Amino acid sequence: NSTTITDKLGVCVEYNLYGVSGRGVFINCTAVGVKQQRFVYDGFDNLIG
Amino acid sequence: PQVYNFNRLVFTNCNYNLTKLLSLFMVNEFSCDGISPDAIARGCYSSLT
Amino acid sequence: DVDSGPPSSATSCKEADMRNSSSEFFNKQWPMP
Amino acid sequence: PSSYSFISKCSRLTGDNSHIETPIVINPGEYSICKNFAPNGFSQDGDYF
Amino acid sequence: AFMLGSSVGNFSNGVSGRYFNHTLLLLPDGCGTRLWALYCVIEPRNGSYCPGNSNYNTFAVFDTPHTDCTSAGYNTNATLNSFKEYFDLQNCSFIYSFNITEDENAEWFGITQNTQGVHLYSSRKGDLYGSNMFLFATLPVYDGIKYYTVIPRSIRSKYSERQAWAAFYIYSLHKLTYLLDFSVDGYIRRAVDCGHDD
Amino acid sequence: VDYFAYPLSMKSYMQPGSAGVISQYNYKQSFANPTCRIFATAPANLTITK
Ligand SMILES: *[C@@H]1O[C@H](CO)[C@@H](O[C@@H]2O[C@H](CO)[C@@H](O)[C@H](O)[C@H]2NC(C)=O)[C@H](O)[C@H]1NC(C)=O
Ligand SMILES: *[C@@H]1O[C@H](CO)[C@@H](O[C@@H]2O[C@H](CO)[C@@H](O)[C@H](O)[C@H]2NC(C)=O)[C@H](O)[C@H]1NC(C)=O
Ligand SMILES: *[C@@H]1O[C@H](CO)[C@@H](O)[C@H](O)[C@H]1NC(C)=O
Ligand SMILES: *[C@@H]1O[C@H](CO)[C@@H](O)[C@H](O)[C@H]1NC(C)=O
């Protein structure tokens, strides 16, 4: 059942989001990047969005 | 087919039941490079060829 | 194999259908590098 | 299948009288130009086409 | 309109440009509202002025604007039927179809091939009012695509319906290192070709 | 020493990283100490039975 982040913002959680696996903190932000691509990375290929 | 006329399968955006497929065949040799069979059985992928 | 539909029942082709031309007809160079 | 088959030679004959013989080899993950001759497996061992 | 294959040679009379095996066809259709992806075996019909006949110069695709692109309905097999007038579609591996919206914008189309098949990119996807190409189709084409041929389109415009048509350019892709500049909204509007100059 | 009866045709199912039922439910080799796998055949005329 643990499938949403609405009321768990700010806490360290693990994630499996369409197969990408990791842990980190989720914070509501202004939409950047391309929404179609579903992920925003950085220059070192770390997920930051 | 034969070896020079191999058939290629590419899997994207789907779920597999590797064990149902693993139990149908009788393995004799394997040699992985950069991954292991258990990691193939427990992971998520952009594509599978 | 998959079905491509019904074949073409036209016996003859349209005979060059804007006739062939490989010459100074086509030199309208509008470069877009 | 009827048997196991593979290509044992693939070569181009050039020169004035096709007197020189150079091999044509595949790249990794690719098909051989020679597969078009007997694409379902060779019938006899030694089938010099 | 394109014709991508692996083996090429002369026709019967001797004109070049014949594909002998499974051939990829990218034929836009529906008066610029549909894209056809066909991976078929292509057979020269023996009829007059067709690729099998002796009196054959060149093949082409077309459509009759007042019957095909009429207001009442848009025929979606016009260019494909005009194609079949020249060739027979046998042993078709797959036939895909992609919808296209009608406009007069400037778009980009790219095509590559790797181990995972044939990849099609278009600016219409993702960035319609820009110029960045996003992958929209992957085709199970695993044979080499050694050759390609631009298929001459010809709108059957009569004297009252004659219209001007834009030219297109085809740039080869090379194995090069670049430097890109992503905007805040993720799109690329500036780059540097590292081998061009000092 | 861990020893048991095992068929030779199945000895790829006890390799490091294998994905079958042997490593899941029968025997997984540990690598905390220096270790070694051996697959052998016992001649039938000795005290060992089948
Ligand atoms: C994954 O594969 C296993 C093996 O096929 C499935 O388990 C069997 O499913 C069938 C369904 O008709 C049952 O009749 C059997 O009793 C199950 N047991 C076995 C070991 O054969 C399992 O359902 C598959 N899982 C999914 C969800 O795909
Ligand atoms: C227009 O072309 C499409 C694709 O060639 C035809 O659609 C196929 O027709 C066959 C035969 O009826 C069917 O078995 C397939 O299921 C159809 N689907 C596709 C996309 O493969 C269509 O019939 C043609 N229509 C006309 C006007 O002839
Ligand atoms: C490809 O076409 C050529 C000539 O049409 C034919 O000789 C060859 O067998 C074909 N390849 C196949 C059927 O794999
Ligand atoms: C291909 O088409 C022919 C008809 O031209 C048919 O006889 C044959 O079974 C089909 N299949 C293949 C791949 O040969």
HEC assignment per residue over chain F: CCCCCCCHHHCCCCCCCCCCCHHHHCCCCCCCCCCCCCCCCCCCCCCCCC
Q: Are E18 and E41 in contact (CB under 8 A)?
A: no
| Cα–Cα distance, E36 to E40 (Å, whole number) | 12
Q: E90 phi and psi, to 5 degrees?
A: -125, 150
Q: CB E143 to CB D29 under 8 A? A: no
Q: Are A26 and A45 in contact (CB under 8 A)?
A: no
Give the three-state DSSP class for A22: strand
Closest-CA residue to C12 (of E156, E155, E51, E25): E51
Tell how strand E153-155 and strand E61-63 pair up.
parallel
| Cα–Cα distance, A20 to A6 (Å, whole number) | 19
Q: Are E9 and E149 in contact (CB under 8 A)?
A: no
Residue B41: how many other CB atoms lie within 10 Å = 15
| Cα–Cα distance, E107 to B25 (Å, whole number) | 49
E101-106: long-range contacts at Cβ-Cβ below 8 A with a sequence spacing of 24 or more? Answer: E101/E33, E102/E31, E102/E32, E102/E33, E105/E129, E106/E131
Tell which of D24, D26, D27, D31 to mutate to test the E interface (max E CBs under 10 Å). D31
Q: CB B36 to CB F16 under 8 A? A: yes
Joined tokens for residue C30: 């509008």
| Cα–Cα distance, E92 to C9 (Å, whole number) | 19
The tally of CA atoms less than 13 A away on the side-chain side of residue E111 is: 16
B-chain residues near F23 (CB < 8 A): 38
Residues 6+ apart with CB under 8 A from E76: E29, E30, E33, E34
Give the three-state DSSP class for B42: helix
DSSP at B34: S
Residues 6+ apart with CB under 8 A from C23: none
Q: B20 phi and psi, to 5 degrees?
A: -60, -30
Q: Are A15 and A22 in contact (CB under 8 A)?
A: yes
Q: Strands of E134-139's sheet, edge to edge?
A: E109-114, E117-122, E134-139
| Cα–Cα distance, D18 to E47 (Å, whole number) | 38
Mutate to test the pocket of ligand 3, among D31, D34, D36 (most ligand atoms within 8 A of CB): D36
Class of residue D40 by CB neighbours under 10 A (exposed 0-12, middle 13-18, buried 19+): exposed
- Mind giving me the DSSP string for chain E? -EEEES-EE--SSS-S-EE-SEEEEEEEETTTTEEEEEEEEEEE--STTSTTSSS-----EEE-HHHHS-SS---SSHHHHHHHTTEEEEEEEEEEEEE---------EEEEEETTEEEEEETTTT-TTS---EEEEEE---S---EEEE--EEE---TTT----------------EEEEE-TTS-EEEEEETTT--
Tokens 């992985």 sit on residue: B32
* Candidate from E45, E81, E92 with C-beta closest to C2: E92
Q: Are E150 and E25 in contact (CB under 8 A)?
A: no
| Cα–Cα distance, F6 to F11 (Å, whole number) | 8
C-chain residues near E156 (CB < 8 A): 17
DSSP at B21: H
Q: E36 phi and psi, to 5 degrees?
A: -100, 125
Q: Tell me the structure's resolution in angstroms, rounded to a single decimal.
A: 2.6
Q: Which chains touch B (3 or more CB pairs under 8 A)?
A: A, D, E, F
Closest-CA residue to C16 (of E44, E68, E56): E56
Joined tokens for residue D6: 């593979």
| Cα–Cα distance, F43 to D47 (Å, whole number) | 46
| Cα–Cα distance, F16 to E159 (Å, whole number) | 77
Joined tokens for residue B28: 């004799």
